[PDB]
Amino acid sequence: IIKAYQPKLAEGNKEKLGKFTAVLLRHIIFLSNQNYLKNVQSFKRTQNALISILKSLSEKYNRELSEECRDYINEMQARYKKNHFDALSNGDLVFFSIIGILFSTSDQYHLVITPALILMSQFLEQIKFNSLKRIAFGAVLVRIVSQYQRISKRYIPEVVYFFQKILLTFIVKPLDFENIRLDSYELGLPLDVDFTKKRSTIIPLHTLSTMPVDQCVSVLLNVMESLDATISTVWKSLPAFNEIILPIQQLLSAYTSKYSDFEKPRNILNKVEKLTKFTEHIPLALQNHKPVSIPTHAPKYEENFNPKMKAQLKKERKFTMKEIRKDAK
Amino acid sequence: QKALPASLVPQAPPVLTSKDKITKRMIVVLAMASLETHKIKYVLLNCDDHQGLLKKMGRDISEARPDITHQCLLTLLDSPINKAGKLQVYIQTSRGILIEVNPTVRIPRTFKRFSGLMVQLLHKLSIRSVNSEEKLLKVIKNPITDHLPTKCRKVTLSFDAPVIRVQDYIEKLDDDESICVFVGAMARGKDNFADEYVDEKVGLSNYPLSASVACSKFCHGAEDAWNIL
Amino acid sequence: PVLTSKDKITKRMIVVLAMASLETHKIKYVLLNCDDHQGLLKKMGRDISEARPDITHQCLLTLLDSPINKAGKLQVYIQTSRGILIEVNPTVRIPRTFKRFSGLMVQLLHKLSIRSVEKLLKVIKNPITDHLPTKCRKVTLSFDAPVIRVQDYIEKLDDDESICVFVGAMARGKDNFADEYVDEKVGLSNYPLSASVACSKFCHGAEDAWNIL
Amino acid sequence: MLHNPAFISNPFQTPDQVANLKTLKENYVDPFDVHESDPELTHALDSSLWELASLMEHYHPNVATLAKIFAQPFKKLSYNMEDFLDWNYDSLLNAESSRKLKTLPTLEFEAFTNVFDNEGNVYLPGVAW
Amino acid sequence: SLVVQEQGSFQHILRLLNTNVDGNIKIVYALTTIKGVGRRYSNLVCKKADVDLHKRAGELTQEELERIVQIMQNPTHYKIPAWFLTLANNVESKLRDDLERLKKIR
């Protein structure tokens, strides 16, 4: 289709391809929503290939793509405005991925990222996360936003909230964390899980639709792996690292106490102890302002200094008076 | 332990004026300034622009350089000490005219415009701001002494005088007192212009110093001495 | 002794007057000025704001007339906005009047050098670094950079090395003219500093640090 | 709370004074108690506000701008509270769509071969189709 | 411990009639700063509004501000008295002619 309607072939092909750029994007989203567990390999051969084509189209049709991207962003609140998570699907997870590919996430303000990041943060907080499918969906969202801030490393409070509840959800309460609001108390992991077998930490998108203990454990590992990365990159730099990490430290301690063999929280914890030790927590000082100079004023003057007609009319009279008055004498 | 000030917003320090005599300040007197107006329009007489005219006036064109007065004011006016509101400048014309320079003034950096300002000040005896809010350049009544602070130290720049460290000099002086430095914008001549008013003469460097260089050097030590930055 | 760019061993405070707005235009060729030639510069498309050379004249006077120059411990460099790099012989006594100063630069730019009967002013080939001492510290004047005591700075630096101070003659502009060559940027005063004032401070500081007096 | 002047470093300050600050610097401990229910006994007044400093790095641009005010002089007498009370995620997105200023959408020069990880360059490691 | 004054706190600044007015200044002369309002006009507006003339602008209450507003915009319905609210070139040419012919006589 792109070859048959190149810009040079005929007038207006630029517009047709630009509209095609928006059309292709929805097709990429549309295929992801469709079931593909039967032919995942064939889907992978199409799904990445179409993205590559979209990247070429976006390089010349970013304007058309951005308009469609906003429209998909705008639409999905409306579906979230009535269906909540039932609106959310695999393609929505795919969509936020594609935006990062085709747009600069490391911007303070961007046309498509800022609507998307605000929208993803809303899911990270508003959504209940009361089912394994829902938690697994949240795990993917956390990874996407982490990649969005892979260079900017801006602080997202919802990420802090999401990690706290999910960690506490799988330990359900132990009566010492009453400040964290849980939405499901029946997802507590059993004591009998080994936590030493090598369980895949990758969450397939197709498994989301199908959604037991192993699936719960894998979601936990993926989420806390992102948690460790967040501490290392973002929270470490923030001035309030000790305050931000303090609730997380206690949650990870509960994991270790209940599970001596389970190693990741100890690694994250031991990492966390090193960060707090090196970081010097000091009284902040920000009102140290630069002094202000005395006021400045330019002088007004004449470039060529000199040592309305009614006034001139009066003036000439006086000279005329003096001559004529003399004349009479 | 001490309570912080109620308002921490940075406020500009008070603009120093001759009426206020208590506050310590840096007084610089650019004595023997060569400024004159003469109809051709009046033009600030210059050594290079006007030599035939001043020859008819009979004055030596060697001491007919308002440039030296101009550069000194730029350095003095642009110094951080001025920005901190701790320096006020006086100019004594060779003909006997005393000029008070407001610390807030922004004289034109270009010399040709600077001549335009000076003919205005000499004729109009005052210079107005664009917003018309304060007196920037005003001619004042002699002697200079009454305009100086009540308690103040007076010195001149003398090449033959002993060389002294300006920082150590200012440090050993008192805290209620102030300092006056009488700098000669004159190109050459006997260093006796301010002998009547001054109590001692000091040297700043072993090598000869320009008026612009010497005044800049002196004020930098005060900033180090008073910690102005 | 009169220092020269050929000599690199001797410790010296180099000052690079970057972004110098020296240009000659013939209607006869004369140095451009922001106010004298306004319509002429408009025909070129170059804004009259950045056509301000006497700042370079002002910086040179205070730099050359400083005691350190009399002590033979300072050399001045001018990197014109156009890309022309100028040597300043420390012995030169440039004219005090700007109108005479302009006549020097027009002669210098066209003739490529000024000789008296050593070239007092001579044009040199870019880049600057070859002319600079082999072992030398480079800094610029940045208002945002931290306020540092020039006397404190020079004292902690080594003796055999040398210091370059990149002062921007430009009235206004982004302070990146010397970023490619300089390794760190330092602020001198909390308050804004003119190019002439700022370079004078370094001359005053170097004199105190090295006890030139 | 926003700043303790005793912890500011002055350039002229003498080296013995310079050494003293580190000893003050090192020995500090945050005295604010979170479990104490008495607002007059939390010892909050002796602590400092680090948490607001992190809000300056908030992902949303305008929200960070509000946090930057505390780094700016307090010229304003007060902020109208009613203009900030009723704000919603929907309102933030609606306001974002209804933006007075329109910008140009741009693209990332970096290229990722695969958008998701396998079960060269992967944009989203740890997630697979 | 909880005390709230119903009058409200003194207001350093107020916004009246799309104009910033200092609370410190007296109500009558603080009201003069608005364009078209002089000392007499402000005095009469204050008298109509039944606002004491020993008050500062900051101390005014909301109802008093609304009343003075309504007095300003709608003057007549409150019965405010209505009263309270080339040739020279030719002459120059004639004079110049006169002067030239005066020279002619002389």
Partner: peptide
């Protein structure tokens, strides 16, 4: 209740540097 306090608060609500030269004319 918000609308009530919107009304009340309505009344409550209310440099040359460096080598820059004075303007030409």
């Amino acid at each position: 209740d918000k609308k009530a306090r919107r009304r009340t608060l309505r009344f409550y609500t209310s440099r040359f540097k460096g080598d820059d030269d004075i303007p030409y004319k």
